[PDB]
Amino acid sequence: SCFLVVASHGLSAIADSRIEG
Amino acid sequence: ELPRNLEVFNEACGHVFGSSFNREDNSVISDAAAFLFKMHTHSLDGQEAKVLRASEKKRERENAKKSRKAPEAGMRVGRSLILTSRWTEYCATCVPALGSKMKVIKASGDAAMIQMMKDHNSLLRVCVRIEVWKARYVSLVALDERIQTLEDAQWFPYLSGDSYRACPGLVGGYFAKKAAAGERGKNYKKLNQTAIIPPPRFLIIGHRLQIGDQVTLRELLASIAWGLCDGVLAECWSPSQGDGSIGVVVGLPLQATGSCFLVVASHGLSAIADSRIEGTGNTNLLEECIAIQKQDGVIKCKRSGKSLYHCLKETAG
Amino acid sequence: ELPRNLEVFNEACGHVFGSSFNREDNSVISDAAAFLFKMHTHSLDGQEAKVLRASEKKRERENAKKSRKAPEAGMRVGRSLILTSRWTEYCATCVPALGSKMKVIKASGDAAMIQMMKDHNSLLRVCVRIEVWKARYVSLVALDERIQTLEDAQWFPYLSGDSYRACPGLVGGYFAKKAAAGERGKNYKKLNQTAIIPPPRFLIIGHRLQIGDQVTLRELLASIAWGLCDGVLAECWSPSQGDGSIGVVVGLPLQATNLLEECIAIQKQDGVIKCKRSGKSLYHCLKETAG
DNA sequence: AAAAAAAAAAAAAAAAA
Known part of the structure; x- marks a missing residue:
């Protein structure tokens, strides 16, 4: 599984959703 | 009643798929658009080979493509699409000959040829948009193995070279990467990854996606974003x-x-x-x-x- | 005793704007410099037409502008600048005719015309410096919508072709991109996006920016950086x-x-x-x- | 020193994995 969240509509890209925090 | 693009797409789909073309299903419309894009790029079996600057392997592949029998009448495509007996006539009539360039046709000055080339270009653009939307829709439930890091994800969608050529502002992939890394000319277009693409059932009708439309979550999300x-x-x-x-x-x-x-x-x-x-x-x-x-x-x-x-x-x- | 580079601009601004031309406000100097830059590029109303190789729409636009009535005395330009009746005479004499090239002037041998062309070149350089500083000052508060990625942020400031021609060193824009794509040579200059441009109230009087000079924060930032x-x-x-x-x-x-x-x-x-x-x-x- | 925020995205006619 891939947890990337590409930037869009002015939002900030995330290289890993889980690691955030 | 409708712009040239949607009229030509409707005519082509109706002629090639007869009465089996469902106008209210996204999957059927996407399958028809993909098949028309394959037909108009000279990629269906039994069409002219691409050998202008082909490597030996490419020469062999194109020769094999040329020799094979073309799709026969009544062949099943997608899930609920069946080719009609008169698709060969449409392919022979409305498909520009391989290597056709708008400059040569304009020099010739044949109005019918110019109109046919314009229709072919419009159909290429419409089918590219439909296929990009379908790629977005598929990305909502099925992750692509190619995309493993944000750098790779930056170039979604991944589509063939002709797909990038037709709609450079929406299609990514190898050719978009090459263009971005290469010299940026006066025709360079930045990849608008999250552009709004109305669903296929609205794309072929001209009803721009707007508030008040009754749609599904997956279709709307694929329209305004991707996976x-x-x-x-x-x-x-x-x-x-x-x-x-x-x-x-x-x-x-x-x-x-x-x-x-x-x-x-x-x-x-x-x-x-x-x-x-x-x-x-x-x-x-x-x-x-x-x-x-x-x-x-x-x-x-x-x-x-x-x-x-x-x-x-x-x-x- | 100021250098001719600044003396020419001061004389032109005076002769054009009378006493209304304040020499202590950055906005006033910038507006006057922009107007003079337009005047010396034949971009105003009722001026010559750039039709050397102009396309159909460009030809029509140039013809319409040429037919369009020229500005009249007393016109309000900017916020605190008013034209003087003398300006036309100035625009009749100091402004070189459209298409005139230094080659022709030098071949003719007229000392007066040669000095006029040198003064015109110096005035264009001064006005482009002022315009670049004004672009930095604007960028420091409101950012251009064109600049979205580092690739686009590499070509700031974005100015017209004439600005680039006058001062290729400091000006960027579309023509800087074209020159970079073309080739690198002796005449080619590398864009210096953060060159020190003294504020217009300091530039027209040869007041090099130095430690101990009273300046607004935005003034200094625009004079040593951009947004x-x-x-x-x-x-x-x-x-x-x-x-x-x-x-x-x-x-x-x-x-x-x-x-x-x-x-x-x-x-x-x-x-x-x-x-x-x-x-x-x-x-x-x-x-x-x-x- | 020389040489859809009076005037900046989406779609169309130009160019062309």
Whole structure:
């Protein structure tokens, strides 16, 4: 599984959703 | 009644697929568009070979393609599409000969040939848009193995060379990467990854996606985003009081153009592609906002911070 | 006793704008310089037409502009500048005829025309310097919508072709991109996006920016940086009693985890010092400090 | 020193994995 969240509509890209925090 | 593009697409699909072409199903329309794109690029078996600058392997592949029998009448395509006996006539009539260039036709001055070439180009563009939308839709439930890092994800969708040529502003892949890394001429177009693409059943009818339309969550999301975009875009939907499979569009996202967070290098410093990311902060990342234009007015919806694909998978649970 | 480079501009501005031409306001000087730049590029109303190789629409636009009535005396330009009846005479004499090239002037041998063309070149250079500084000043508060990625931020400022031709060194824009794509040679110049341009109230009087000169924070930042540069440059300005949009310059930068550890060199009255980078653009830093 | 925020995205006619 891939947890990337590409930037869009002015939002900030995330290289890993889980690691955030 | 309709622009040239949608009229030509409807004519081509009706001629090639007869009465089996369902005009209210996204999957059938996508299959028909993909098949028409294959036919118009000289890629169906039994068509002219591409040997102008082909490597020996390419020469062999194209020769094999030429020798093989072309699709026969009544062949099954997709799930509920069946070719009619008169698709060969359409292919021979409305498909420009391999290598045809608009300059040569204009020099010849044949009005019919110019009209046919314009129709062919319009159909290429429409089918490219439909196929990009279908790629987005597939990305909502099936992750692509190619995309493993943000650098790779930056170039989605991955499509063939002719797909990039037809709609450079929407199609990514190898050719978009090459163009971006190469010299940027007067015709260079930046990859607008999250451009609005109305569903295939609205794309061939001209009804631009707007508030009040009754659509599904997956179709709307594939229209305004793709699998790995943030999940807050799901706020653009509201389930109805009936079955609930098809809801209503309440508001659409706005392409953010408020502020730029870059920091250009100067006096020996180094550039920063994004101030928030390189700051190693988390408080701001969890309290971001997206500007959704609704019927009432603009609203700032806080980002959910999880991929759209994962959000949909969790919701389906 | 000012150099001809600035004497020509001062004389032109005076002869054109009368006494209304304030020589102590950056906005006034910038508006006057922009108007004179337009005048010397035949871009005003009722002036010559650039139809050397213009396309159909461009030809029609040039013809319409040529037919369009020229400005009249007393016209309000900017906010605090009013034309003088003498301007036409000036525009009749000092402005070279459209298409005139230094080759023809030199071949003719007329000393008066040669000096006129030299003065015209100097005036164009001065006006382009003023325009570049004005672009930086504007960028420091409101950012261009064109600049979205570092690739686009590499070509700021975005000015017309004439501006690039007059001062290729400082001006960027579409034509700078075209020249970069073309080739590199002896005539080619490398864009210096952070060159020190003295403020217009200092440029037209040969007042080189130096430590101990009273300047607004935005003035100094525009004169040593632009909107998207690193925020650490704010360390070069120190306020005064009640600030009041006035302060002083304390240093001028050189070369006009660890990523945030990069340091910039600042020259002070004593010696070179290293100041840690902030990581936030000057635009955002000023916006946040405002409120 | 020389040489759809009076005037900046989406779609169309030009160019062309």
